[PDB]
Design a protein around this ligand. Structure first.
Ligand SMILES: Nc1nc(Nc2cccc(S(N)(=O)=O)c2)sc1C(=O)c1ccccc1
Length: 294
């Protein structure tokens, strides 16, 4: 606290509040997350000290982890804007496709890296995707679900966004796979394209039903084992899959094809980050510069 010259609240993360702070000594400007205890799971602190080694250009760098006074502080490299704010600022014009494509490609590179090291994000959303003036986009605020036991409620009772949650999580699957991050990224990709959230649920059931209404209620044909999942109910309504050209107009067929593969119901059929990077949609990918007003 005395090591970081005052501050400036830049939001309230999923676990606590996030601040923009300056290293009272080095003068370094960083993002500081203050995690709000009764001892702090040594297991969690250990799994954290593992994210410190995760270095990659498309992953926000975790500089230090500091436990003190029952409070936990995570020091991260600071970026000036998040994708949620950038999308709202581009809502009237839309983000140009080359930039959408560049961001998607970089995020898949970041995910391919995390996933090859057996690390899952679990909570990807526009708010935790950070961008800079150089055209880079980075994954931040990695969630460590289960962590202490089973996270499902915050302290500030701040509403949890379900818009990007994979269907297997909603159906009660106990073990998440790398596929959950691909689903979330697919939802984000669609949102950059249409400038509207793909599946804006207000509850867990509304989230699930919004997905079903668009992609069709899943069955054993498209998703083997789905009817035996924990929260699956034979009473779910049966919606026909909607024509996909109506989902993300006016995205081209290469884009629509990749998105359809990122949104497959069966986590085992869902495309991997590595395979996605080889999709035809990225044959002409470039690295444009965004117009950022800081
Ligand atoms: N690294 C990092 N940078 C951030 N910047 C930022 C983000 C939004 C607005 C503004 S600003 N200046 O007010 O325009 C700045 S946030 C963050 C996180 O590491 C993080 C931590 C928890 C949850 C999500 C990201």
């Amino acid at each position: 606290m005395e090591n970081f010259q005052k501050v400036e609240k830049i939001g309230e993360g999923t676990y606590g509040v996030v601040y923009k702070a300056r290293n009272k000594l080095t003068g370094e400007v960083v993002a500081l997350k203050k995690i709000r205890t009764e001892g702090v799971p040594s297991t969690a602190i250990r799994e954290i000290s593992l994210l410190k080694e995760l270095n990659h250009p498309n992953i926000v760098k975790l500089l230090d982890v500091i436990h003190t006074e029952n409070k936990l502080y995570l020091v991260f490299e600071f970026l000036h804007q998040d994708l949620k704010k950038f999308m709202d600022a581009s809502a009237l014009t839309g983000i140009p496709l080359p930039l959408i494509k560049s961001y998607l490609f970089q995020l898949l590179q970041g995910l391919a890296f995390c996933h090859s090291h057996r690390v899952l994000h679990r909570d990807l959303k526009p708010q935790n995707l950070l961008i800079n003036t150089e055209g880079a986009i980075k994954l931040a605020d990695f969630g460590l679900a289960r962590a202490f036991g089973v996270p499902v409620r915050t302290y500030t009772h701040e509403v949890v966004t379900l818009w990007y949650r994979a269907p297997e999580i909603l159906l009660g699957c106990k073990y998440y796979s790398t596929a959950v991050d691909i689903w979330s990224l697919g939802c984000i990709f669609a949102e950059m394209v249409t400038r509207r959230a793909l599946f804006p649920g207000d509850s867990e059931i509304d989230q699930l039903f919004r997905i079903f209404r668009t992609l069709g209620t899943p069955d054993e044909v498209v998703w083997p084992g789905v009817t035996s999942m924990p929260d699956y109910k034979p009473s779910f309504p049966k919606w026909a899959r909607q024509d996909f050209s109506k989902v993300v107009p006016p995205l081209d067929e290469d884009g629509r094809s990749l998105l359809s593969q990122m949104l497959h119901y069966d986590p085992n059929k869902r495309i991997s980050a590595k395979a996605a990077l080889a999709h035809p949609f990225f044959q002409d990918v470039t690295k444009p510069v965004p117009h950022l007003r800081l």
